[PDB]
Every structure is written in structure tokens, then in C-alpha cells.
Point group: D3
Chain length 160, copies 6
């Protein structure tokens, strides 16, 4: 039943790291990546969340065609990439479009093929390899229930 | 003499149906189309209108090169696709860029070739063929005068 | 076990109908489609076949990213779109990349979702709607065994 | 030390002249160019400036990959294209991304190759050749110090 | 009645000057243009011609969507850009797709708007402005009859 | 003085690994990469070479704009990425366009910034991380003289 709006900052296939300045809603180029890598899925954040790192809760959205930076997509969670890096906690909720029956076979983390999960993991483990002062201390996939709990606490913190 | 601003939601060639949330101005992905079709022209709505269905009045803009979702174009009407579907009234005002002399030969509906009008009609008749609970009860091209009258009543309703 | 080379003429998303002149191997623009439609998959033909219509046997290839006109892909069949139209027999063998374990769950026609099969069918039923003298008398999905038999007889005829 | 935010209106390679309506922040298509030319760099304006013509101060940003219309980039100046045309003063501050060590060899106007400066000049001298009532009375490259002084007076005027 | 095959070397919108090595049929990058310009139409040459400069006769093809380098298009002439430059004679036959009724209103040079002809001329007059040792001594539009005569003598020379 | 023709198989930014079948000259999709990586430069091979692994000698070409698969570029070497992996020797000659004065400041390996060399290295070290049975035993940059010697022995072997 859980769904939420994701703002996509970075379309799949991008090496330009876009993002939003959350005070204004403007889209910003943070940087061009230093590695020859590209975002593996459309990437952004869940609107109206205050996450575990004090930032909006990040999201990955599986789509048949990418969007543009700044576009909203109603999404539902199917799992989460738990990661601790130099920022601190840096989890990414894995999502599919909400209300779209083409995605109904994808309900939980076991419904996403390992080839896809492994490629996503590889991106986050390596994309900052050529930036100084970066590290990854934990990176693991967890299930929809864990994802939903993180979204829930982050919605509550935003409202608090 | 009539001109108005159109916000383009969907560039020509798109199968992603973008959209604007009119309460906020945000661009949203409504859905990926279920048919192997693509918008035949840049598509969006006329700013500051309250149309016949209680929604902003839709517009099609003929252009030499598409824009991006959310971009404004000053436009003038040359005709209108009158359609009744499952939404109710669902007219699309056909437009060209205002103030651009390259378009001065296009003044009314007879100035747009049948091949183009027929392709536009085909899109709207078929793009929802693989969605349940959709229908098209009337679909016909009408002239600039009819278009202008619809814009006019919709500008008035918005202001009311 | 069956695999073959497909030459892709038309990448997914194209309204330019490319395609090969089989006497020379050159890529040709046949025409821009008359409907606001776009090829639903990468599309082309199986090399070294002489099909049921006396032409190379057509193929559809499911891919994570389209190719360019003229590119070869080693493919294996998973089913076939049987169609009779104004050309005569006009079957399209549905394929996935051969030797790619990411596709191992797709073995036969039941492994491709109805939403995808229906969209492909819709394309072939409608893309010539605005061309004179076109028709579709039969259009149905059949299984891998039927596909393989058609490939086999077409390889034999080419060699004969 | 000087840096500022540039809003890119027009990505490198565009013939669509996008954009910002400064009263609302909306992106608008001004026009399709009348010449077969394309913006030589990402192009836009410096936020929070009131320039010599009473408009926001224009900026060119050198980048490894273009952005989208409306995107912010933190930039630092390395020189300026001084031009007087039919608008009046129409200077363009030449910039590189701020805080990006890949650009540290570019500090002043002599660090940008003549081939690049000449191509940029050529664009501004010629892109309006097929529009009536246009002219260019002065077009010359000046150094970072001149650029910084113009930015400074324009920041002050905006604040005044 | 005249038609011929054009090989498109350079799609509309390109700054890469592709392309064919006529001895092999391979596509080559000649150079990236030195000016911030882009080919105004799809551009290439007429197959099986030996033109006035001893090279294949160049062609411009008006299309609703560009092709890829190396693609053939059956075309018919509607006029010609006569030019003398540093190569010598350097005429470009202006064409539309043959057998395509969407183009039937375009028969001769007067059927192509001045805005389009002027933009094409502008490209050829200026694209080599920043290359040494280039010049344009004559550049004028001529009619279909002149174009057809040039094609005819070039077909004859190729065969001779 | 050394120059040669490179056939580009893979444009910069690609995750499709194109590719040439050297017996026919056809372009083939080998595979979609298994990692979220993209070729860091245009990539291909030097024509008329028989390299150290018994295959054509691979090349990387620095360009302002990518080409298409199968396109020739006259190139000159400026260094080489020496690598031993599961294939055996797998060197990539680093090149710039020959005869193009915009590249005259790039003569040897020290003229290419470390950020760029490091990104290229990162690609080759990591792009097969999620393929079984792959390894990299040596990966280092060497100078133009080493590159030229490898090209020379490979031209000789091809001719032998």
C-alpha cells in the first residue's frame, strides 16, 4: 500500500551528477563524475522526507524510459540499498512506478534480478573511486519491509 | 491577433506522458504509454485557462525542433482537434509560434496538410487502445474561429 | 540450442523505416512512417534466410539498449508473431540475445509479458493505418517451436 | 576567489534559443535561430546580477558535458566576451566550474585556446545574420580582471 | 520523373563532417567543423555520378527526420545551390524523397521558403570562415531544370 | 610523423560493446556491459594491424564529439595503455586526430591530464568486474615511442 513521490534528479545513463537545492527546488549540477560510470537507474529523493543522515531519503526508480532532472514520479518501494559511506548513512530506496500494473510482479527485493542489483551496487561502490576522501563501510540489499520502515521514520521526522 | 503562452509538457516523439501538477507547477511522469506510439507534436496546455472539462485547455504546437517538458512558448491558434473521450471534452488547440514570420503561411486549419492532421488524429484515437475503460466518441478538426472562441471562454472562466 | 545472426535495421523507438538492400548490404530509408508510431523493439531480419514470402525472415530482438541500423546481434528465438498482410506472409521471429545469461528466464512465448506482446501486436496492426492499400488478415503469437521450424525451413531454402 | 551561480538557459549545441523569464523563473523558447548555428558553449546568466544593459549578466560555461535548460552551475570567471550590438552592451562572462580541480589550469583568458575563443566569437558575430535590424559594433575578448569587475558592479546594482 | 539514390553522409544538425571514401564505401570523419555551425539539411552525394569538379555530385535532402551516415535515400531534385569555392565547382542538388506524396507540393525551387534557402546558403558561405585558404566566389540558387541537367551530365560522365 | 586509420567501434559514452567482425567488416553487438560503466573515449582498432595478441591493435581516440560505430578517423599516437588481462596482451594506443592543429599541444603522454588517464584506466580495470573469469595483471601508461613501436611491429605482422 505504501507509495510516495520521488523527484528524479539524475536520469539513468548520466555522468552529470545533478542535485536539487532543497531550499529552493532548483536543479544544480553538483559535478561531472570523475569515473567513467553512469547512474544505473533514475535516481533522486523522496519528497517530504528527513532521512537518517538529516538529508532527504534517496531513491532509485526502475523505469522503461528515463525522465528529465526535476520530474516527479509516484513510486512504491520494493527494497533498499543500505550503505554507509563518508557522508554517513546513505541508503537508497529501490522503487517501481505506483499504480502501474506492468510492475505488479515486482513486490520485494527477490523480484529484482541479481544482475541488476549487482550493477547498482557496483555503481555506488565505485563511482567515487577517483575522488579523494571517499569510502564505503557497508553496502547491502535489504527488503521492502526495511525500506518501508525507513520511509516511515523519515516522513515522521520531516513532519516533526 | 490572438496569442497566448503554452506550457509544453510533452515534446514531440515522446512515449513518456508528462503532465504538470497545476497546483505547484511541478512536472510529473503520469505514465509510460501502453501503445507503441509517440506524441505527434509538442503537447501541453494554455496558461491561465479553465477549459470545457474544468481542466487547463490543451494545446498542440507545431515547431521546427521540440522543446523540453515545462518550457513556455508564445503561440497563436490555427485550428483545433475537437474530441470527446472518457474524460469528457478533450479538445486540443492547434498552434504555431507567435511572432515568427516563418509560420505566417499557416493561419487556419486548411493551411496544415491532411497528412499531418490525420497523423495527429491517429495518435489521439489509438494511444489509449491498450488501456482499460477508454473511448473516443467524437474526433474532428475545426477551424481557427472555433479554437479562438474556446480559448476566449476558457480565459474568462479562469478569471471568474 | 538454436541461434542465428540478426541484422537490426530499425532500432527501438524509430519512426524512420530503414531497410537493407539485400543485393548490396546497404542501409536505405524506405520511408518515414505515416502514423505517429515507433518500432516497439529493435527490428530486422535473420541473416542467410529465405522466408515464406520469398524475403529474409524478419526478427524482433529484445534488448536493454537499442543498436544502430546495420548492426548484427547473435540471437535465439523465443516465439513468433504470425501475420498475414498485403505482402502475404509476414512473420516476425521474437528473439533475445544468445549467450547472455541475463535473458535465461526467457525461453518461450509465455515468458514475455502480455503488455509487451500486446504493444508489439498493436504496432504491426496499426502502423500502416494511414497508407493506402494495406491490410492485416491474421495476427497471432505462436511459440518457440513454431518459430524454430520457420527459421529452419528458411535456412534450408536459402541454401537450396 | 570569485565564484557565483550561473543558470544555464541554453546547452551547448542548441539552435533553440531558450531564455528565463526573470519575473517567474520559467524557461521560455524565445525562438528557433534563423541561421544554421548552435550555441558554442552552455550559455545563460549569472544569478543576482543587474548588468550594464539593465539585464542579468550573461555567462558562458565551459563543461565536459552540457546540462539542461534551467540548471544551476557554480562557476568562476576566466575572461569575458565584450560586445556591443543592437541591444546595447551585451557582454558574456566566460567561466569554468568552481571547485573542480580538472579546470585549475584555466585561470585567465590566455588559458583558453584561440580556436575555442574564435569559434565563440564567430557564433555571436553571425547567429543573427538572417534577422532584420541586428548589428555588432564591437566584439573583443578581455581578461579575468575585467570580467570580475563587471560581475562586481552587477552584483552591487542588483542589491541596490 | 528524375530520381536517384543519395547517400547521406551528414545528418542535419551535425558539426562532425563525415564523408565517404568512394574507393571503399567506408564512412570517415573528415573533421570537426571549426565554426559553431551545423549542417542545415541531411547532406551527401548522388550515387553513380561524376560531377563538374571530378567528384560525386553533392546533394541536400529535405526530410522530416534525419538519417544516419551512410544511409541511402531515393530522392528527386527540386533545385540546386550553385557555388564556386576553393575546391572549384561545388554545387549541391536540393532534393526531396522520391515517391513520397507528402512532398508533392515541392516541385521546383520556388516551392522552398526563402527562410530555408537562406539558412542553407548561410551555412555554406560561413562554415569554413575559421579555416585558412577558403573562399566563396559565387553562391546562388538555381531551378530544377538546371539541377537535372547537372545530374544528367554527371551520370553520363560516371558511365563514360 | 606516424599516422594511421582507426575504425571506431564504440563511441564515447556507450554501454553497448560493439565490435567489428574482421572477416567481413560488419559491426556486431558483442554484449551490453554488465557494469554501470561507459567507454571513456571513442574506442576501436587500427586498420591493417596484427597486434601482440594476434588481434587488430586497439585504439582510443580523443575527440571533441563522438562518431558512430564503423567510422574511420585518421589518427596519430600520443601514448598507450599497456594492459595484460584474461585475453593476454591487450594494449590500447591513445590517439588524437591527425592533421588537426587543435590537437598540436598533445604530442606525448605527459600532455594528457592525469584526471583523463586515470578515468580511462578505471574503465578498463573495472568494466568486467561483474563478468566471470576476468582479470587484470598489469595496467600502466607508456609513452608515444612505445606506442609507435607497437604500431610498427603490428603493421609489419599484418603485411607478413
Amino acid at each position: 500500500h505504501m507509495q510516495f513521490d520521488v523527484t528524479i534528479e539524475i536520469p539513468k545513463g548520466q555522468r552529470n551528477k545533478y542535485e536539487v537545492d532543497h531550499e529552493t527546488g532548483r536543479v544544480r549540477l553538483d559535478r561531472y563524475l570523475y569515473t567513467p560510470m553512469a547512474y544505473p537507474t533514475d535516481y533522486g529523493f523522496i519528497e517530504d522526507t528527513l532521512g537518517d543522515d538529516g538529508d532527504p531519503l534517496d531513491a532509485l526508480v526502475l523505469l522503461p524510459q528515463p525522465v528529465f532532472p526535476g520530474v516527479l514520479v509516484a513510486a512504491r518501494p520494493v527494497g533498499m540499498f543500505r550503505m554507509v559511506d563518508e557522508h554517513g548513512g546513505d541508503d537508497k530506496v529501490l522503487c517501481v512506478p505506483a499504480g502501474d500494473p506492468r510492475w505488479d510482479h515486482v513486490q520485494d527485493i527477490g523480484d529484482v534480478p541479481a544482475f541488476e542489483l549487482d550493477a547498482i551496487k557496483h555503481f555506488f561502490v565505485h563511482y567515487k573511486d577517483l575522488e579523494p576522501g571517499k569510502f564505503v563501510k557497508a553496502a547491502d540489499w535489504v527488503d521492502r519491509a526495511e525500506a518501508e520502515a525507513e520511509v516511515q521514520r523519515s516522513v515522521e521526522r520531516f513532519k516533526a
